Amino acid sequence: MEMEKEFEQIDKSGSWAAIYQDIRHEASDFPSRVAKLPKNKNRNRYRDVSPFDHSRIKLHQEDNDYINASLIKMEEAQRSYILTQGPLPNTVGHFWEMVWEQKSRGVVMLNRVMEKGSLKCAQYWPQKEEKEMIFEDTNLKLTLISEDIKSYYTVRQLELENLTTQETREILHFHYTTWPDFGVPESPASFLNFLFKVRESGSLSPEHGPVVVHCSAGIGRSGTFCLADTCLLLMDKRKDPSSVDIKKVLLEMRKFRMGLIQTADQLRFSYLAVIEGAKFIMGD
Numbered sequence: 001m002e003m004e005k006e007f008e009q010i011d012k013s014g015s016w017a018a019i020y021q022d023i024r025h026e027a028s029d030f031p032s033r034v035a036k037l038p039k040n041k042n043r044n045r046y047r048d049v050s051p052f053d054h055s056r057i058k059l060h061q062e063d064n065d066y067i068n069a070s071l072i073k074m075e076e077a078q079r080s081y082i083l084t085q086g087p088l089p090n091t092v093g094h095f096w097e098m099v100w101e102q103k104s105r106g107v108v109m110l111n112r113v114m115e116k117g118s119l120k121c122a123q124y125w126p127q128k129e130e131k132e133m134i135f136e137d138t139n140l141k142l143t144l145i146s147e148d149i150k151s152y153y154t155v156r157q158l159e160l161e162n163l164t165t166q167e168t169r170e171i172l173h174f175h176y177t178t179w180p181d182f183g184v185p186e187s188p189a190s191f192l193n194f195l196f197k198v199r200e201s202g203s204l205s206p207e208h209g210p211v212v213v214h215c216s217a218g219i220g221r222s223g224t225f226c227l228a229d230t231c232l233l234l235m236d237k238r239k240d241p242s243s244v245d246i247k248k249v250l251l252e253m254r255k256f257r258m259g260l261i262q263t264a265d266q267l268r269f270s271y272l273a274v275i276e277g278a279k280f281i282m283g284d
């Protein structure tokens with residue numbers, strides 16, 4: 001059923017809360033035993049948001065391999081994402097170790113360091129060229145190379161150096177800075193242009209490791225980003241784009257990380273985003 005007609009039917013009936021609860025009821029439940037070990041308590045921002053054991057990213061070290069991050073592998077779309085929590089003061093070194101070990105080109109950040117007057121993640125990248133950051137626990141150096149500040153987002157070029165081998169790589173930081181404190185954006189136009197700019201960079205392409213995506217918990221905004229990306233890609237691949245079922249794609253993605261899409265308003269925004277994105281590719 002053409003998802004726009006499905007959209008108008010749920011709007012006119014006001015049944016977004018009912019649709020969302022049905023997804024919550026059908027979603028996969030897999031064990032998260034490593035996340036709940038006592039040694040990992042200070043590695044988790046939220047007690048109720050944990051990676052499944054089968055899809056968790058493992059750090060390459062014998063001491064403690066744990067990070068709150070999941071590999072979302074979308075087989076038909078041929079896209080992979082790592083979804084992770086905003087880094088904590090004691091996990092910033094782990095975060096950059098993961099970027100290095102997974103060969104990621106891009107980091108997508110969908111939150112502000114401070115929102116609603118509280119800290120939603122650590123200040124994990126350098127703010128000035130001449131003040132680099134050293135992570136002694138993982139033996140990495142991070143330098144700001146350049147910064148481009150636009151009205152709805154900021155792009156930064158970073159250099160990550162493995163101090164063990166003296167290899168260096170360029171990482172692109174894509175920072176969406178205007179997600180409102182309450183609810184979701186009124187129009188999806190600035191969000192869709194942000195995805196297109198991430199795509200344009202090469203960060204989502206198969207010649208690199210998976211893109212690293214985060215918000216505060218790594219399920220809400222983060223879920224919206226990868227759901228919209230994957231749905232639009234399937235519409236360009238499938239003989240009949242009308243066959244793309246956003247609820248079925250969300251359930252597939254929830255096999256790899258719990259809780260993706262946190263509210264019925266986030267669900268409606270994802271639809272809205274996918275509906276408006278299809279008109280620029282297929283319509284005019």
Ligand SMILES: O=C1NC[C@H]2CCN(C(=O)OCc3ccccc3)CC[C@H]12
Pocket residue numbers: 192193194195196232276277278280281
């Ligand atoms: O701001 C803009 N004006 C022209 C547009 C050209 C590329 N854009 C696009 O394809 O539209 C939505 C979308 C984004 C990703 C995938 C499918 C559809 C992003 C917005 C751009």
